[PDB]
């Protein structure tokens with residue numbers, strides 16, 4: 562999996578299948594944060610899906 | 613919080629988010645942490661999960 566990044570494209574580590582876009586603050590990257598506070602959260606499992 | 617529903621509703625006390633999950637189309641209260649998905653959208657406004 563590859564994901565857009567802002568905290569560029571980055572390749573996630575093996576096993577991290579999702580990408581995410583979090584708004585509270587703007588973050589983009591690998592994974593899908595489960596514990597992190599957000600206002601809008603978007604996770605998707607396609608390459609570069611998290612704009 | 614009030615959220616659109618598909619599986620239209622006021623969430624229980626303390627559930628602050630709404631969600632729209634695609635793998636399957638589900639809408640409702642909360643933000644599922646363990647449930648499989650292809651696209652997941654969670655948001656913390658009334659009726660934000662279309």
Ligand SMILES: [Cl-]
Nearest residue numbers: 577578579592
């Ligand atoms: Cl993951």
Ligand SMILES: [Cl-]
Nearest residue numbers: 577591592593
């Ligand atoms: Cl992860």
Ligand SMILES: [Cl-]
Nearest residue numbers: 579592593594
């Ligand atoms: Cl995860």
Ligand SMILES: [Cl-]
Nearest residue numbers: 613614657658
């Ligand atoms: Cl409310």
Ligand SMILES: [Cl-]
Nearest residue numbers: 613614657658
């Ligand atoms: Cl409200």
Ligand SMILES: [Zn+2]
Nearest residue numbers: 613614657658
């Ligand atoms: Zn309200």
